From a paper:
Here, we introduce a highly ordered nitroxide side chain, designated R9, attached at a single cysteine residue via a non-reducible thioether linkage. The nitroxide side chain formed by the reaction, designated R9, has a stable thioether linkage that tolerates the commonly used reducing reagents and has a short linker that positions the nitroxide close to the protein backbone. The R9 side chain has been introduced at solvent-exposed sites in T4 Lysozyme (T4L) carrying cysteine mutations in the pseudo wild-type background. Structures of R9 at two helical sites in T4 Lysozyme were determined by X-ray crystallography and the mobility in helical sequences was characterized by EPR spectral lineshape analysis, Saturation Transfer EPR, and Saturation Recovery EPR.
To identify the interactions that constrain the internal motion of R9 at helical sites, a 1.60 Å crystal structure of T4L containing R9 side chains at positions 65 and 76 in Helix C (T4L 65R9/76R9) was solved and refined to an R-factor of 19.8%; refinement statistics are provided in SI. There is little difference between the backbone dihedral angles along Helix C in T4L 65R9/76R9 and the T4L structures, indicating that R9 does not distort the local helical geometry. Remarkably, the 2FO–FC electron density map reveals a single conformation of the side chain at both sites 65 and 76, with nearly all non-hydrogen atoms resolved. Due to the short linkage of the R9 side chain, the nitroxide ring resides close to the backbone in the {t, t} rotamer and is sufficiently closely packed to exclude solvent on one side of the ring. In addition, the inter-residue interaction of the ester oxygen with Cα-H hydrogen of the i-3 residue is identified as potential Cα-H···O H-bonds. Collectively, these attractive interactions stabilize the position of the nitroxide ring and are apparently involved in the relative immobilization of R9 compared to R1. Interestingly, the most probable distance for the 65R9/76R9 (20.08 Å) is significantly longer than the interspin distance determined from the crystal structure (17.56 Å). The rotamer at 65R9 is the more likely candidate since R9 makes direct contact with a symmetry-related molecule in the crystal lattice that may stabilize {t, t}, and such interactions would be absent in the solution.
Residue numbers in the entry: 1 to 162
Write the structure that this text describes.
């Protein structure tokens, strides 16, 4: 198991534009296209991301291509953020993947706002951090996925993904 296999489980794979759990146009392995309600706006975003006129459908190879860029962008966002980089640097590789997972789902700024959870992770107070992380809109709106990510933070193992 690794961050790619982890997010592939959490995000799925769909080759046509669909609406994500928030109602936002998405494609591939959780590639958010736009929060705009305009399907043409989402299709324009898709064409720009792929470099061709797609009419809202991509191939599996294209989906995996976007996914690799998106995982990279999540890591890049963490390492440039003054709030997230210290926590990331302090973590083992499995818990690092859990933080990347959260940034992939909610964005750099969103995760960087989890000030008290981040402190608890930095302190390596894993059970306490797990309790705090669940006190969130994130957990309430996607509880099964959040439970898996939180278990990964709590234990430092892949138990929730096997
Ligand atoms: C990845 C791609 C790919 O692997 O599909 C063959 C394309 C669509 C060529 N490219 O735009 C990226 C780099 C996104
Ligand atoms: C890092 C980036 C990156 O390396 O994506 C793979 C982008 C998204 C260009 N950038 O905004 C940071 C600095 C976060």
């Amino acid at each position: 198991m690794n961050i790619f296999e982890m997010l592939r489980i959490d995000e799925g794979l769909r080759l046509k534009i669909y609406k994500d759990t928030e109602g936002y146009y998405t494609i591939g392995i959780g590639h958010l296209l736009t929060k705009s309600p305009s399907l043409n706006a989402a299709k324009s975003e898709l064409d720009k991301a792929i470099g061709r006129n797609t009419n809202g459908v991509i191939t599996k190879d294209e989906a995996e291509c976007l996914f690799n860029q998106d995982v990279d962008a999540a890591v890049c966002g963490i390492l440039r953020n003054a709030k997230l980089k210290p926590v990331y640097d302090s973590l083992d590789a499995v818990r690092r993947a859990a933080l990347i997972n959260m940034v992939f789902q909610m964005g750099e700024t969103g995760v960087a706002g989890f000030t008290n959870s981040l402190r608890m992770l930095q302190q390596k107070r894993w059970d306490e951090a797990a309790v705090n992380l669940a006190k969130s809109r994130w957990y309430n709106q996607t509880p099964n996925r959040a439970k898996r990510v939180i278990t990964t933070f709590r234990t430092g193992t892949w138990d929730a993904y096997k």
